[PDB]
Design a protein around this ligand. Structure first.
Ligand code: SF4
Length: 543
């Protein structure tokens, strides 16, 4: 018997699933608590949906619990059994009262009704509501593909909500989509249709977050980020939440403590607003998976606003602060999951007692090519395509990971002819944002759109070129898609691309284990998805 079963991220054991201990570090019991949190949440999804159907209101506070639950179960997000158990209790209470409000409490699934307050009971319930619970291969593949897509969506929705932006149609769809993954009467065609609709709402979440980020901190602009370090003690902030960064910087003003970014917080450097704080140093390190090394050589406090957090080493566990839905037993947690005021004076005091950062690289990188910035260079990018200056755009956005086969992406980018342009977003950029690919007619051969949620800009840019060149099919543009994925956020980006009609997508370093043969077949026949081989072989085939 398996102590657990999880295959939501690309590093899943044998690309089949984790049964004893997650490669990520997630323990059997933590994964069980996560399986219960999802079940009762979907259960809460059905209740909130029935209420809206009866014409009744559902306070937004409910939409926040749902998103918080989902996000907390994303890879490298929360490993704290105490916070998961309590969130399971919170969800049981919440759904128990919303359901009291219904008029016709009929047909409510088990997930909607079941409840427990004792951790031991939650672990038993989990043992029968996890993945395996769905027998039929094709319907399981689709139910979990949507659920993961819904995890990524929720995360983007929460960051938009943290900035005060939220749409009722988004929260309503999410909650209804979750309720449908428990419906035994949905055909496979229904689930395929729901997979595409999810992708659609995927585009909405990213568009909602794009607006929230840009509206509060300005449109990203061409920026030069220093990757070297200073001499003052500092705090390294990681993740994707920009709100926490505004508070951290306002509060670190005048204390002598500098602020650095890590992994997916690099893009914050691209915003005009944050450029007004003198103590906002550079971006330290690379993708998340090198944090055991980089968090250590940074010497100062490390703030994790979201995933990806790798189980800490004792050498720096004491200076690791989590916040929002992030969590690790033994690591100090700063309360706040809705952009409310956060008190970072403890982490700022802690930094004054730490050695300044130990430099590991010097120089700088260019970035800030989001939709608003590239559209302003449109005519210039278009004259380059027309003249043959830029023979091909290569989208390599996505998420990075530990797999050493990912050296592929570094060789791919390194081997591309010098008349091509790489478009990136997401921490997958680290595999090649530190090389020297030069430029084409003054346009960098690596255009960083931003975070993974900024794949949205790459999408906008493409639709724009299709309009300009008056093409009927977006796929007729000189764009090759060589995307890398890791967790559920990369999975909602993919479904967004599929809903937008983008085809010929190459996914790697491997294809999701939760994609069953027949389901994988449809992706191949309808959107022509493919995997990768050698960088030299694909540099020939892909073109
Ligand atoms: S999140 Fe990935 S590594 Fe961790 S248990 Fe899941 S599938 Fe395995």
């Amino acid at each position: 018997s398996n102590a657990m079963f999880c295959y939501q991220c690309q590093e899943t054991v044998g690309n089949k699933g984790c049964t004893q201990v997650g490669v990520c570090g997630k323990k059997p019991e933590t994964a069980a608590l996560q399986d219960a949190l999802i079940y009762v949440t979907k259960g809460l999804g059905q209740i909130a949906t029935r209420l809206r159907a009866e014409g009744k209101a559902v306070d937004h506070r409910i939409d926040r619990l749902v998103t918080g639950n989902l996000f907390a179960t994303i890879t490298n997000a929360n490993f704290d059994d105490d916070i998961l158990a309590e969130r399971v209790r919170m969800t049981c209470a919440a759904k128990k009262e919303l359901a009291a409000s219904l008029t016709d409490k009929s047909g409510l699934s088990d997930a909607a009704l079941w409840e427990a307050s004792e951790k031991s009971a939650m672990l038993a319930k989990a043992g029968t509501v996890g993945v395996m619970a769905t027998t039929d291969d094709d319907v399981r593949s689709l139910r979990w593909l949507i659920t993961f897509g819904l995890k990524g969506m929720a995360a983007y929705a929460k960051h938009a909500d943290v900035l005060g932006k939220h749409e009722n149609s988004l929260d309503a769809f999410m909650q209804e989509a979750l309720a449908k993954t428990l419906d035994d009467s949905l055909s496979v065609a229904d689930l395929v249709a729901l997979t595409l609709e999810t992708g659609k709402f995927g585009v909405s979440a990213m568009a909602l977050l794009d607006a929230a980020n840009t509206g509060t901190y300005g449109h990203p602009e061409i920026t030069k980020v220093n990757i070297g370090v200073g001499s003052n003690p500092g705090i390294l902030i990681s993740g994707h939440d920009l709100r926490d960064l505004e508070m951290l910087l306002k509060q670190t003003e005048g204390t002598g403590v500098d602020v650095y970014t890590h992994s997916e917080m690099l893009p914050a450097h691209y915003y005009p607003a944050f450029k007004k704080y003198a103590h906002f140093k550079g971006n330290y390190g690379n993708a998340w998976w090198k944090q055991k090394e980089e968090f250590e050589s940074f010497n100062g406090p490390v703030l994790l606003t979201t995933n990806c957090l790798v189980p800490p080493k004792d050498s720096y566990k004491d200076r690791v602060y989590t916040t929002g839905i992030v969590g690790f037993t033994g690591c100090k947690h700063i309360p706040g999951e809705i952009g409310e005021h956060k008190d970072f004076s403890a982490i700022i005091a802690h930094a004054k007692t730490c050695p300044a950062p130990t430099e590991i690289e010097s120089g700088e990188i260019i970035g800030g090519f989001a939709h608003n910035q590239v559209l302003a260079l449109a005519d210039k990018v278009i004259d380059a395509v027309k003249s043959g200056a830029i023979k091909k755009f290569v989208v390599m956005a996505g998420c990075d990971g530990r797999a050493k086969s990912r050296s592929y992406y570094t060789d791919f980018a390194e081997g591309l002819p010098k008349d091509t342009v790489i478009l990136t977003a997401g921490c997958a950029k680290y595999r090649y944002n530190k090389l020297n690919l030069g430029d084409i007619g003054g346009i960098p051969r690596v255009l960083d759109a931003g975070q993974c949620n900024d794949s949205y800009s790459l999408a906008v840019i493409a639709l724009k070129l299709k309009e300009v060149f008056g093409l009927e099919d977006v796929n007729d543009l000189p764009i090759v898609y060589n995307i890398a994925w890791y967790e559920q956020k990369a999975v909602i980006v993919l479904l967004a691309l599929l809903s937008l009609g983008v085809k010929n997508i190459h996914l790697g370093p491997t294809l999701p284990a939760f994609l069953s043969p027949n389901v994988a077949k449809v992706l191949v026949e309808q959107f022509n998805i493919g995997g990768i081989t050698s960088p030299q072989d694909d540099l020939k085939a892909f073109f």
